[PDB]
RNA sequence: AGUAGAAACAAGGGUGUCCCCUGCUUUUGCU
């Protein structure tokens, strides 16, 4: 009614008639931003200067008929003069205060339901529990965390479609929501937001902020989680740690852990299967985590885990180009190498057929408990800078790096035959055979590896073969960095191919992931996991 | 056939059809069988929808409600919007693809088709393409055949007959043109078009003129680059290059660095916006917080507390000014204060009369008239604005004394921080106690008094400048403090008269006349007060320990100026605190990360740890953590008060020399490529600023002390 | 806390 | 005395 | 006892007290008058560093251009611009060899980018030069003016909305024999081919303000709308290339830069007892943007885009060509004064070509005499250099290539080098068995840089054992130390509005705690100071206080009216409940449970007139200018309330002849606002449609009326009335 | 005079001493 009346009044005038009748809808995106107002170049100075004026604020014309011209003290609240470049009217902050003390009161019941993110933040803080303060040297590792607890891991486009359906139902267009999770979210939000007077744009913005996973590269000192990073300023410090437990659980962490557990179990059961590829594909399409089919989670969940990467690549999707060895992810930094096949003899008089890498190279190795950077030459180790939570993690990192170096010094350190097999009773490749053998025990290797003196430099320390810190002695090219060795930020997503044995090979042919690289650790699921396939029965 | 189709349809129908086919990006002059098919579809659909209304009860109507809603012949956006709205409101699920129209009587979507082929073939094709069971499908034939779902025809027999007749007559017309046989409809193939971006004309010439010297065309350069393989080019050119092009490392040893060369000239003079060490305040015990009462009433009360007013007389005249004007300005201020006193009503602000003395002192009508160049090109003395370097000044000994006095402790607290949320976490309790220590050490520092005075003065100046740009406004210099006995005091330093303040640019200047009380005789350090006209306005009987001693009380009167940017940055001087405190905090925390405990209490209550912070004739002097905090606070405050591009340049250049000296101290074997250039860059920033000169002198002292 | 300095 | 915040009765 | 804070460095290492050396509590230097002198000095310096080049007269613009590419090799250590094409090509080839497939994949990604980017992407600029108005205008306004002028001149390929189509329109307009423009009393002006060509290649020069650490002001340039798209595509390609290089510090943030620097430093430093020395250079290049040549960038792009479609190569190549044929405006001009007559006047820079030299002083006279040969149509011809310097990512690629040339397989010597590069800045590390090898490696790097046109500032650089260094004000001393002063200007009232300012202050404190090692007590005192400054700026002191302000009466009345005082916002005289634990909570939600029902309903009333919602991209988004670097976008968490108002704009334009645009602007808003009343989603996702505004509006009105009537929410009389009105509008559209 | 520093402010426009308009808008780039 009033819309057509406004359109008629607009069509009355000639210039605006031409503007309306000669500009296409696409041109709206440009002419609406058309403005003579230069972007402010010193907002602080401008605000300090303008708050000393009489009418610094702008308000809609309705304010004229909504609040009185003058206050009880004859203090003017709004002025008739229009704001430059619009029909808004200049008004004073006294007008805002008068509104707050005398304006039309309205029931605010959807606000907690619309701004759910902030209210969840405050509830989590209120229900949290604190602990003691530990004054000690703090080791901070820079890691890519996700500062957005409580989101439904919906991408930009799916989030946009859900927001369009919820807030602007008639403008959905040609898209029909398919994933039952999206339908559930849409129906829920439509029910909660029914009869909501808040401006549609703010509701859409809040839904987008709540449903999309954000990320930042931050120096985390302790645990990583959407609820622990959120309160990072209050937990970690330069020289102190504040023990704290947020008073709330977030479904995203639950689904992440449950997906990790399910992928690990499914790959473990697929290794034994006669057809690992077909069995893995069937298990992927025939399982549910917390009422959600795993196929939908996999295409959207960005969590990184060898089992998760194997499952994601099985159906066919881009994965990180860094290769998995010994439970560590290796991302190449500089240099290059060529694969040369060779034969080698161990200290137990056994022939091993290995594929050595010839050439200078640099890698960054990231593990669950420790991380390092490795400068490696052809069949020789140049440098290994490592840092871990505790001594055992550093030991595991050093072992995997030493095995990866392919040096003959650790080859002749082998004692006994290498007869390691997988769960399916199949012989492993020589590299993983050596890795397992040295993981069982490493006294001989660490003793029979080498010893060289070092320079005492701050932030660095040595390790002896018995794995005790030293200040004047260390191994060959191995140094423990007291300060956390920062991990990589971005990893290239590349096409890969998977054979019938779940060995993931890239275009160059090198193997990135394999079931033998999946950890044997078994945790407790946070969400109920159900398997509809015949094998898991 | 284009004429046959165009002339045999309603202009609106052809317009809709052509717009619809253009929406896909096709060329109407190229594909026309599609055009004919879509135009026939539009015509049949319009006949289907037209001549059909619904009355109030919901029955048919043949000549208000429209029985049929059209979907074809519309932009994809509008069609999708209308179908989505219909599906939402009616409840019928929307189809995957776009139907042709919608019917309200039966409340379902119906598809219309016109095909030369038999009805069954196209019916099956469309039905198995859309794959919908709740949408009607109606197929027409050029030969009169027609069929809908379950053989159920929605439209009346008369409407179907009319549609068939229209189709038959248009087919007869097309056959009369003879192209009916060679029509065979047309289907959408969704072609893909490769991109192209050609460089031709003027731009090709520009490209040909934007290549290395040896190439004449862009194509030749492209061919050369594509067929390029690295063949010792860099190595050959390195061999060819002269050996004089090298980066020779100069060893930086303990005997390498030399003291900075300070500029020579007349001694530097005071340039702050208010007195710092010589300020005298008249105080009254008033139980009010910062910025509570009326400034003018407080000023009058403070003035009342002083007896011993004397007839003003020039003591130290302004060399380049008109001192009688300053005397008259002070007399006028006194008279106006008396007038407001004998009024029984104190307004928030007072506007001074625009007398001749204030007109001169505040730079009234000093801007040259603005004229067009064509009107004054023949003027003999018309020339460019003076843009020479500022005259050089030598460092004077008063700036060091100012800094020394700014680092002292005061008998009154100067900062009353606001409240914050209550402590709930142990780390918050530790932070609260640490901040209590900090604010205790900082609340009684003269630098904090300078911070508060500057913030108040700049805030008042900015507010007055914005509020009254055309009036000479009087502003008292007022501060609030708490004595060591806990009694609140309001102090008056002096007065400021703000002139016209039509400030447009952030660098535009507003002039003001500042008259401040003091007890220091200017004649002891005349060079420091070259910009001032100092008067004597009384003899104060100071209360010393032995007894009472009478001393003259002087009024330092000067003309100063400030810009919007300077006032704004003076309003934010409080953040200076943060700087110092941050530096202090990191110093404690670092030492607390080795002892596994908080040493804040130890540092602040035992004074066992000291840092070298000053210089004495015996050597380097060390101070406590509180002294270090006060010194850093004073340095930050003086940086705020004496900001200038010279300070920025000196800081930036001397940072590198400090880092090089530190590397030498760390035994890292530093080396320089051009140390003389660095020294020249540092020295170019020392011209006349007393603060920068003092910083350079400090650097020289540190250099002497850090290399032995 | 009552700040104090030797000077 | 203090040449900034003295006492003058 | 004389207090000397510098002496503190005798005990605390300089890095550990580096914040003491940053005087960022005072105002930064500002330019007061014209920038013409700096621009002329820049042009003369650019033509002096490459004066041993080939002089050519452009056939199109008729301008004198200087070509130093493949010129005489340097013979001294002064800045040089004689880059060698083959050396640059070899550097690019070796960069490709070190990272095979980098160029191909980056080209594919950027090519996918090109076909999808929209013309509206150009609106996210800042004060673009407007050749139509011949002055700086906001990016969106400049784009709209350019589109209108193109349309009036029969250049309508940009209706498709693709940026590449707009580039095709620019290409075609370049060949037009006559351009028609409209100048405000609308008047028509005709520009010949050469005039329009010079206008399209012009850069508006001004002076930079609020720069720290410099004693002398310097000039910056801003291009027009004719070159923005080409530069955007070139920068997208450069960004794609840089992302894949471990030695490139762009476009990653501070944390990633610190991680990369730590990784490289630890990699190089660590060695056994005595096998090789490592020395880090904290280098800095001199006249970086005055010695880089657009021709070298063209060679780099040509090599990068090998074995690619021709159209892609042309699109990527247009930008270097335009930059090679650029012209620079000489600022506002000068101001003359007369003491005897007490007069002042403005002399436009357009007149400097033939003005008497008796007015100017010695230095300005010399500058004018030196630059006179290059002047054309009031603009100076500047072929060499990169004055504007908007190729910040290709220069990073060149620096990374020079760094990568330091591998042991490329030096073929005992010495080698590695490090990080960030456009102009760079940190180097050279490893060699002895000091002689270190000197040899440093000399090799310096000479290669000279060959590639990069000049290292020997005055601003030093070398020391690789334990401590600096990089873009990040100070590393066996680990990165805190530099709090760098962020000091961020601690204050941002100046957006009450709610946004509170949110931004709290967030800034939280982030400086997380990243810059801000102490707990320092954070608490920063909160106290921010609350004080906020209260004073917005005159929202506590209701019970006796502070005299224009807003005191209303706040006092609201305070006495309220029952639960702890629920009021600080903007309404409420108390401050923020502390370290809850620095991540918006204020409205922080004290939601303590607010009165009436006050809560009034404050959170979606029917208030003070809240205006623009496109979603600006929701809870603010522009913040840091102490160093360009302005950034910051997202803050806040609930939209009556305190989210918008401050008034500048009205000076009302007194000029450009006021016509103001009126025009208002008209647009009306239409745009009306569109929102028919397409409420239009503010969330940009609508698309070729039909006119009126057609879509009338169609939607018809459908909405029909649907609402069928739903029974409107009586037939109202539906008939609106149907009649819509018919009236539809018929009035034809006439 | 004063601010200030490589160029500026010390009000600028408008209309016929009053009145009207303006306080970033002939000048603030780029990842
Ligand atoms: Mg630099």
Author numbering:
A (entry chain C): 1 to 537
B (entry chain A): 1 to 63, 72 to 716
C (entry chain G): 22 to 28
D (entry chain P): 8 to 16
E (entry chain B): 1 to 184, 206 to 756
Show sentences the authors wrote:
The viral RNA dependent RNA polymerase (FluPol) is a key determinant of viral host-range and pathogenicity, and a prime target for antiviral drugs. It is a ~260 kDa heterotrimer composed of the subunits PB1 (polymerase basic protein 1), PB2 (polymerase basic protein 2) and PA (polymerase acidic protein). A direct interaction between FluPol and the disordered C-terminal domain (CTD) of the largest RNAP II subunit is essential for ‘cap-snatching’. We show that the CTD, jointly with ANP32, enhances FluPol replication activity and we demonstrate in structural studies that CTD-binding to the FluPol is consistent with replication activity.
A second structure was obtained at 2.9 Å resolution where FluPol with PB2-C mid-link and cap-binding domains take a replicase-like configuration (PB2-C(R)), with the 627-domain remaining flexible. These three structures show FluPol in the pre-initiation state mode A, with the 3′ end of the v51_mut_S template (3′-UCG…) in the active site and the priming loop fully extended and well ordered. The template is positioned with C2 and G3 respectively at the −1 and +1 positions, whilst only the phosphate of U1 is visible. Importantly, a replicase-like initiation complex (PB2-C(R)/ENDO(T)) is observed for the first time, characterised by the radically different position of the cap-binding domain compared to the transcriptase conformation, which was never observed during extensive studies of cap-dependent transcription. Continuous density between the two sites, with 25 connecting residues coming from five CTD repeats, is observed for the pre-initiation state and the elongation structures, whereas for the replicase-like structure, the connectivity is lost between both sites. Furthermore, we suggest that the full replicase conformation (including the otherwise flexible 627-domain) is only fully stabilised in the context of the replicase-encapsidase complex.
